[model samples]
Each structure stands twice: as structure tokens, then as C-alpha cells.
Target: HKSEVAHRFKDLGEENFKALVLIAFAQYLQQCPFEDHVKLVNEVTEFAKTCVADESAENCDKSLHTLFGDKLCTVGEMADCCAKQEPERNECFLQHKDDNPNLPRLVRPEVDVMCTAFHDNEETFLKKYLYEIARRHPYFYAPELLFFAKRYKAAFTECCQAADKAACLLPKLDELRDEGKASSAKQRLKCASLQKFGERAFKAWAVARLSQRFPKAEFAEVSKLVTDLTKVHTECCHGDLLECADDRADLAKYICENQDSISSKLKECCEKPLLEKSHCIAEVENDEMPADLPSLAVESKDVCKNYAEAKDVFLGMFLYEYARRHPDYSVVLLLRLAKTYETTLEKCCDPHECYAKVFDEPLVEEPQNLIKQNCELFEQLGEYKFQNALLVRYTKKVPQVSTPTLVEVSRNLGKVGSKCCKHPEAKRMPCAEDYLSVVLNQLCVLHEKTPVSDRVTKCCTESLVNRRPCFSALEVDETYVPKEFNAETFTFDICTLSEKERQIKKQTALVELVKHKPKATKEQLKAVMDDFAAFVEKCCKADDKETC
Candidate 1:
């Protein structure tokens, strides 16, 4: 039944035929060239898979996948129809993203063009691919996709550019003015000053009378802003920066305010302080008041109430700005922190000025009693909260030096040959270089000393392999194996013993179980076993002892 074993069992002499195969080679594999030996192993592996058990084959699957991955598809692999699943055909068939062995490199891009042609419309294309993709890769948003998705975007952009350029070139040339309409590549944009002034003026006039609705809001001197925007749709009709439709609509918006009932409301908005104050107070009371409360939550409308409400409004704005910057953090973390620190401040403050971290220190807040203390403390808490808010928002660590913080921390480090060593006063008073060097050497040694974490773990792992220390047991014996009992000597001899003698042996077995559950500890186990042998002597003497 056996053919020449060398040719028959390709897996016999080398490679992992099974897990934990420490079996010596059936034939001694001598000093063959490393390459030739590896080639033989490959041949052996290729043939062995047919006969290998499912477990061994699973290990091989794990190994080959680690090496060649999707490109090295086996016939045993199950897959979907590659033609229909166009985007994922390669992956379905266990193929690498760019590895197409059958196709020549030059014409490969045509396949991509063909594939995108199927999904020319994104909405239509996303339906099939996304479904399969979403099922297979549930965690698609994970960091794993970042690199590949970036590549896809870059490649798609280039292809789109090529397509767009081709589309652009096929069209006929336009009129001379159209060609002249090319804009500067990059330009800084400012809100037009003339248009702003005009906007302000038009609303003011609009409320005056039916005819006076459109105010002549033009600036006293035509600012540069007016010339630039108007040129886009007028003399420069073909400007790409702005469309004619947009230009007309913006101008209409400027004119309409003066015509309708908006005219009267528009006039009040022109007085700077009155406008800002009224709008500020209105929005403030509306935002802060409970849902059931009156829009003018407090009826007094007196100066003090207005001041208090205004302060509340500014605080809301500050919090909103802080939250907007750091969308990731929970606002509650900041709110609780704010409540903790405001030990000092004034009762009546412009909310904007109430948040000052520097003025809100612990020492600053303590001496001042509740009447004087809270206002300042509260102000300080707000400032610290703002800094923390900024850190959470920007995903940036706070700078150390310019800190108005809840807690102050300072880092002291020493460096050799520092500037102080070169200073004349320092050099005269002491051998600064020598002094600095000695201290720095000691500091380096201290800073870089082995960490306790590494030391403890290292010691623990080493204990498993090393000899254990001996226990203080009197009269040790070497004959008895701690983990085992000699059944031949124990069974009859142990049974022949009196009830007390048998109880002592039973006690020894119980004690052995407690000392080591599975495998006995070497030194302590040997000592315990020796101590049990001596206890047997005492138990047999007709006088049972109390202690070891």
C-alpha cells in the first residue's frame, strides 16, 4: 500500500502537518540551500492540502490570508457573480484592489471608465454597491476606511477633471468679451461698505411715506466696495464671480424694505444704540424665559431689570459660543465646573465682564465674604470654563505659561550647560557649569529610573520559570512527590491504621489540596510533604500531637 514515502507524502518531512508538531523529521533534513529547501516546502504544502484535516487547513487558511490575501483565491472559496457586483467583484472573488493579472496595464483604465459608466448617476449607483458594502462592512465609518477612501476620492477627482476637460474642449469658442471674463484665481473678499451704508439708508427712508420707501442710502463718498459688486453684472455682464439673477435679487432686497409695512420697523433699526439694545433685550428675555412665561418675563421694564436681563443674555451668548466651538463635549461638564468655582463676584455685572479667570482664584475668592466674594469667584469660574471650552472645541491642549486656570501647575526641568552657567554673576558666585552638571546628572538618573510598573510585571513573569525559595520546615524528606501519593504503599498500610491514624492521613490529603490545587509550588510543596511524613510518625505513636 505504501509508495516511496518521499513522493507519496509531500507533508511528511517539513512544514506544519498539524498544530504543535514538534515531531522529529522522518528523514533528517540536512544542509540544503535555503532557497531549494523552501521550494521543496512549497511543493510539499501544495500537495498536502488535499489530504490535510479541516483543522490543519484552517491554520493554512489563516497563514495564506496573512501573506497573499484576496488575490490568492482558492477554488474552494464561495462568491457572488462578479459581473453584477461590479464594484466589489474583485473582493468577492478574493482579488486585490488593483491586481488584474489577465489584463494588460495600459487598457485597465477602460474597465474603470466602464465601471463608473454603470453608476454615472450617484443616486442610482449607490443603491446596489452600498447595500452589499453596508452589510459586509458594518463599521465602514471606522478609521480603517480613511486611507482607501482618500485614495478613491483622489482618483475620482482626477477622472472627473479629465472628463470635464474633454467636455470643455469639445465646445466652440465664445465671443471676445466672454473670454475677457476670466477672474483672478484667488481674491480676498470684504463685505461692500457702500452697499452696507445704502442698505442702512434705504430702510430708514422706506418707513417715511409710500413714495419715500426707497431710501437713498448711498455712502457720502462712493467707497471702493460699490464699484466692484456693480461691475459684475453691469459693464462686466459675463463675470463668473456673480450671476445677473443674483445681482438683481440683492438690489431688490435693498429696495423692498422702504416700500411695505417694513418701512416703520426699519426706522427704529437705524438708531444704533436703540436698535442694538431693544433687539438684545428682546432676544434675551425670549431665550431665557420658561416656555409658559410671558415674552417680557419680568414686567417692570425698569433700568435695573434690563441690566440684569442683559447680563444673563451675554452669558448665554458666551456659553453658546463656547459650545459651538466644542461640539463634541457635553455642555453639562462645563456647567457643573462653572457652579463649583464662582466664589467671588458682584451682584450687578455686565454678563460679558463676569467671566474673568484671573480674578477668580481661590485666594482671591476666600478673603471676600459672600456679599463681596461670590461675584468675583463667579467671574473667575466663567473665564476658566471658557479656556476649557476652547480646549475641547479646538482639540488642542492648553498652553502652560499664560494660564488663568482652576488649578495651577508648574513644571521644573534641568538641562546641562544652561544659559545660567554662562552668566558672569552665576559664574563668579559658583562653578555654575560644574554645579549644573552634577545636579543635571542626578536628575537624569532619577527621571529615567526603571518605572515600578515594568519592574513588577517583569518580576511576576520571571517567577513562573525560576526556582522558588524554601519554607522553614523542620526535618525535610526528599522521597515523597508532593503532587502524588504512592498508591501501593498507602492503600493497605493506610487502612490497617486505627481510626485516629486514618483521620491524620485524610487530614494530610485535605491539607495538600489547600496548599496546591493543580500543580504544587516546588519549595513550599516539598517542605509540606516532608512535614506530613513527620506528622505520620507522631500519629502512629498512640499520642497524637496538637501542633507541627
Candidate 2:
């Protein structure tokens, strides 16, 4: 670092400067895939350069004109004129120093020179230019930048620094412990931000707060580090320094308690005045409080009709249905079943990706056990509604749905139970076809249109014919079969098989058919066999009663 320039400095080596220019030019010449990156950079740089030119830092004057001429400045035309006439502009200069600058003046001796020369004073020149650019072209440095001369990563650093500090956390902890009494806490520890402390710090703070409101319980120190909750802002990706192993159970417990407290406070807030309550609920001509019910179980086609039961029942019914049908066909409907179901069942979704998208969990649905339990519960409800007339519909009348033949009953009950589950928002069953196959397999086995496993009864665990090869696709042929083959001599088909078999067998016999079907699959082979089997079956049907 050679110290050469006195007023302005840029202590850059020729080789490094050349490399920087080459790299920047190379990047500039090549169109980056990122949208309008070059354009954005050019715009920002132009504005920055313009600001510098006005402040007599940058050599480029066109940029200054483009940015400030007739756009940002009202008296831009007269700026140069005023700068040229210095002594004439000197009058009342101090009076308008903060407002109108003596711009026409051809820059004073001290101001005219670069703040620092290129070699010795690089930092000073950089600071001076940055200050000018940051002050004038505020957009160049995002987030109210006139107050600070940094942008992008620099502003991000400001957020990180603010987040990491202890003082910033005090108000948050206070808000978390807002209730005068602990509500249910044995003690109220104040200054939770001062968690990692010895006698004079964390414990003392905790004791003082606890003694004030919750004096009965023994005060103790909590050494957990209060930090920015956002993982994005964290410098240390792992646990706090100086702490050995992180026992997340304590952290999780605290989070749970914290959430509970917040929820309780919100509930308390919801106790609005009668007018506010009326406004909060659906406006009705003669709204009244619900009377005590004789029994609790109730049924409704659309749960949204009743405010108290809307979200709850929607979720309950969804879960009930999901569980019920899961035995016959497994489906997880988080969005449909839960009040906060924030997902949709759609195509092109990976189960893991969808789970994370819905729950923001790092992993996909790992709670298979939970899912299994919910499914079983649903099945039980289906069985109860279909098989036994034990439960009343609409909380009063026992219905015919309970009295149908078991399969019909189950189907009817499944319809009611699965109301919400069928919604498109339940997070797409990516493998809907697979589930359809499962259900169809069961039907094929029994040769029945509907299932026999009543609600609460476990589905058949019997080994499947190619694992329940049945599909929800009742019957279909998109006509994707191979072409027909012809005899070499007569140019006619030799195979006496039907059009379907002729079509399939053509793949091997027709001209270069194997080229089209280079590789064979189990399903493809099965299709071929089915084609041949159909031929044999048709022949047998035409020939004899039992023997063909």
C-alpha cells in the first residue's frame, strides 16, 4: 500500500485493476440469466456517478445530467451558472447552506480538489464519495440511506448487528411476560434477555422481578441465550458459544409456554364489548347466545354456517374422513382437516416438498404414527355412522345411513365423513392414482362395487394381486397399443387375434417394432398378455360351453 496521493487516494495495482476491469467487463458483456441485472447495475451506477459529478467527485457529467437534470432538481439548469459565479453566489450562502447550495460557484479551492489523492488517501476519498452518493442518491443505498452511507449487504449488516444486541431483546421479553401475574407461572423472571448471567447479571435480574410479583416461588437463573429468532440473520448457525450441549427440550418447553401465554392473552383480547362482538360475528337480525345443548354431537353440510363450530368442525370432519378412508385409501388432508390448513392437493407436488410447504417443517410427514391414529379414529366414526344406529344425526335424529347394508352404509358414512377431505386444498394426493388402485384392488378381490370393512374395522391386510392392481379408473383404453403386423407374402396379418392383440403383437412382429419398444416393462408385458388372454377368451366363448 504505497501512500502517494495527498487529497484523494486509490492505492490500486495495475495488475489487480486490470483483472477487476476484465472481470467486470466480461460479466457485463455476457448476459446474465438473472433478470435485468446489468440494467439495474447500470441504473444504480449512473445515479451514483451523477451524484458524484454534482458533488465534484466523479468525472462523468452526463450521468449527473440524466439523474438530476429537470428530474430530481428544480433549478438544475442554473446549477452550473451559479457555480461559475462564485463571489455573486457567496451572498447569504450560510443562510441557505442546509437548503440551497452555492452550486454555480466553480467549487472553492478546498472543495474543488479530490478529498484524498489516489494512493495514500484511498479510504478518505472512498468515504467522501460514498457520503456524497449516499446523501444525494438515497435509492442507491436502500432503507432511508441518507442517515447511513451503506446499501444492500451494508444495510443487511445493520439489521444483523441490531438483532444480535442484548438491548434490542429487552422489550420483546417484557412483552412475552406482559401479564402482571404469571397467569400460571410459579414465578415471573424479569430481564429474560439477561439469561446468560452469573450472580450479578441473569440471576439478580430474575430475582428482582420474581420477588416483586411472584415472591413465593424460589427464584432461579435461566441461562438460555435470547437471540434473533430468524435463522436467516444468524452468524453462528448452531447453539451459543461457551455452552456445552444444547438440550432443546428446555427451549421447546419455553417456546410452548410462550405460545400458550400469547394465545391466552389474545383470547382475553377477543372478549370485546357487545357491539364489537356483534361486529366480529356474522351480523344477524336477532342474534342470541346459544343455549345449553342436551347433547354435543351435531352434523352440518357446511360447517362455515356456525361461527363457533365452523373452523373446529371443518377440521374435525376432515380428520375423521381422512382417517376413515385411509384404511381403504390413505390420504393426508392437512389443509382440509385443520383450521390453519394452508395447502392444496395438486399435481407436480412431492410429498416431502408439500409437507414442508404446508407446515414449514424441514422434513416431510414424519409423524406417520399421528397420521395412523387420526386415520383409525376416522374409520371408527365411519363405522359408527354406517353400522350402528348408536349415534344421532344432526345431534338428534338417528338416520337410515346407519341401517344400510354394511357396504352401502360405509359408503354413505364415508360420504359424510369425507366431505372436507375431498376439497382441492387438502394438499394434493400426489399419488391419487395409487390410492385409487388400492381401493380398486379391494373391490376386485371381493368383486363388489363397495368395501365391506366397516368403520373402525381394519382394512384387509391380505397380499394383493400385484399389490392391489385395481385403479379408480373404472375402465379405459386411451388406444396407446402398438400397430398391426402384416404377413410377408400376402401383406395381411397372420395373427388371428383381435384388433387389440394385433396391435400389441405388432410391436415385436411389425417392421422395426422392437426398435420402438427397446425396453419392456412389467406393466407393458402384462398389457400384452391381457391382449392375448382376451383373444383366447373370445375364442373360448365362441367355441364351447366349458371347453374351447
lDDT by residue (418-479, candidate 2, tens digit) is: 43234342222322322332333322323222333221112222212122222211122223
Per-residue lDDT of 382-486 in model 1, one digit per residue for the tens?
433322222221111111111111011110111112323233431211222222222222222222232222222232233111101111111222222333433
Each prediction's whole-model lDDT (CA): 0.27, 0.27
Positional deviation of residue 311's Cα in model 1 after best superposition, in angstroms? 6.6
Could you report the Cα RMSD, in angstroms, for every candidate shown? 33.5, 29.3
The lowest-lDDT stretch of 10 consecutive residues in candidate 1 is 182-191
Off by over 4 Å in 1: 1-123, 128-154, 157-312, 318-548
